[PDB]
Paper text:
In this program against the [name] (Mtb) cytochrome P450 [name] (the gene for which is essential for Mtb viability), overlapping fragments were found in both heme‐binding and non‐heme‐coordinating active‐site positions. Their elaboration via a fragment merging strategy proved highly successful for the heme‐binding fragments, but this was not recapitulated by compounds based on the non‐heme‐coordinating triazolylphenol fragment 1 (fragment 1­ KD=∼1.7 mm, merged fragment series 2–4­ KD=∼1–3 mm). Thorough investigation of the crystallographic active‐site complex, coupled with virtual screening, led to new structural scaffolds that were anticipated to alleviate the internal strain by subtly altering the ligands’ binding pose using a double hydrogen bond with a nearby Gln385 residue.
Author numbering: 5 to 396
């Protein structure tokens, strides 16, 4: 049969297959889990082209009858969430509220990381660094950034193992959790105690005359989607970064010894990250030449981030973490172009502070199981181990 995507849910190694495709056929046809055909793009040059040409549309991926990567877990209008935010005149305000720059926010991240780590040391090895460190760090950060109660984090988080599924078919639970989580965020907008963070800001703008015709549904949706995307993305990235560090003891020791190099190491950890389980989907809105292929209007294109980020033509010795590259932020871990991640700085800070805190508290961190014993989540939009058992 035609080559099927994805190739592997493992987030600890890139398949050899990826370099062979990039060399032989850096754009080629594949079949997705729904049985649709798509073009898989796997070189830095071609990934960048697709991402920088808006005629490859994000929004149009949601059109009825399109070839699909996977089934929607959001309303179709939510695929255009950033466009809807810009159209409501809310982009600057949202972007400002999710920077890691608010007074106290970095200290709160540090404090939270340290407390989680003290609790694991009290309890004794083995510790699970996903469920008991990275994901609670992510969840606490996002409650603080949104201005919502910390104690509401866990129930919101538990929606995410369904919300970020990569399924061939619609998921009944996704609707149940979406509607419940929208109702919660609508209640937050009406709650006078919520005066800080992204929700406190949205709540003020909602009652300002310049935003009187912005819908209550959009305001709630921003809350739900920014919580879910940020939590899943920071928690998953930090988890798989910790694997890459733990398996580079020389690097772990360098960063421990010289923590000022942590921002450069996180940037390399981003470059090499396999967190995104699928290419980023786009729908062609015109006939467009990409390499040796004429992509036709209506066809699905999948931009393979690791294809670009491990391309030796751009990043020589791609599989090695080198802290002195001349082009260190030029990876595609946060995307490129119109839909460049709005949370990028926040994501970087979360990882930096989590890593700094772990290396200080557990300088001897190591896996407590052979690496092949990690259980990789399937049929999900992220690659993540179900547990990350460590000792120190
Ligand atoms: C290390 C952490 C993160 C990584 C690796 C990541 C990665 C990405 C990538 C690759 C995209 C582009 C998707 C595409 O073009 O199809 C994206 C978009 C997005 N990110 Fe992130 N992200 C992270 C953190 C965050 C955070 C913290 C938030 C929010 C608080 C966030 C919110 C979103 C949203 C809302 C979009 C969609 C933007 C659009 O539709 O134009 N991300 N992210
Ligand atoms: N691609 C996705 N899969 N699942 C979601 C999502 C986010 C939060 C939820 O509670 C439910 C689904 C998304 C999502 C997240 C952020 C967006 O701007 C648009 C879509």
């Amino acid at each position: 049969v035609l080559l099927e995507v994805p190739f592997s849910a493992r987030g600890d190694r890139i398949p050899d297959a990826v370099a062979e495709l990039r060399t032989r056929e850096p754009i080629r046809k594949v079949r997705t889990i729904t049985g649709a055909e798509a073009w898989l793009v796997s070189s830095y040059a071609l990934c960048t082209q697709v991402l920088e040409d808006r005629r490859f549309s994000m929004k149009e991926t949601a059109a009825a009858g399109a070839p699909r990567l996977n089934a929607l877990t959001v309303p179709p209008e939510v695929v255009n969430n950033m466009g809807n935010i810009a159209d409501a005149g809310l982009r600057k305000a949202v972007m400002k509220a999710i920077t890691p720059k608010a007074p106290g926010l970095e200290q709160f991240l540090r404090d939270t990381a340290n407390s989680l780590l003290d609790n694991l040391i009290t309890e004794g090895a083995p510790a699970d660094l996903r469920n008991d460190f990275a994901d609670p760090l992510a969840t606490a950060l996002h409650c603080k950034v949104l201005g919502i109660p910390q104690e509401d984090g866990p129930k919101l988080f538990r929606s995410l193992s369904i919300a970020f599924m990569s399924s061939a078919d619609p998921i009944p639970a996704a609707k149940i959790n979406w509607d419940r989580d929208i109702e919660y965020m609508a209640g937050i907008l009406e709650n006078p105690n919520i005066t800080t963070g992204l929700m406190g800001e949205l709540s003020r703008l909602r009652k300002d005359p310049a935003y009187s015709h912005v819908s209550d549904e959009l305001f709630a949706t921003i809350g739900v989607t920014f919580f879910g995307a940020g939590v899943i993305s920071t928690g998953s990235f930090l988890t798989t970064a910790l694997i890459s560090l733990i398996q580079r003891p020389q690097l772990r020791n360098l960063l421990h010894e010289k923590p000022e190099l942590i921002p450069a190491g996180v940037e390399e950890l981003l470059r090499i990250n396999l967190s995104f389980a699928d290419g980023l989907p786009r729908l062609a809105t015109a006939d467009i030449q990409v390499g040796d292929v004429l992509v036709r209007k209506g066809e699905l294109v999948l931009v393979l981030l690791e294809g670009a980020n491990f391309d030796p033509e751009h990043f020589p010795n791609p599989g090695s973490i080198e802290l002195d590259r001349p082009n260190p932020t030029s990876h595609l871990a946060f995307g490129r172009g119109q839909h460049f991640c709005p949370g990028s700085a926040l994501g970087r800070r979360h990882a930096q502070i989590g890593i700094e805190a772990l290396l200080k508290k557990m300088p001897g961190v190591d896996l407590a199981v052979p690496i092949d014993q990690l259980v990789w989540r399937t049929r999900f939009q992220r690659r993540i181990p179900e547990r990350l058992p460590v000792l120190w």
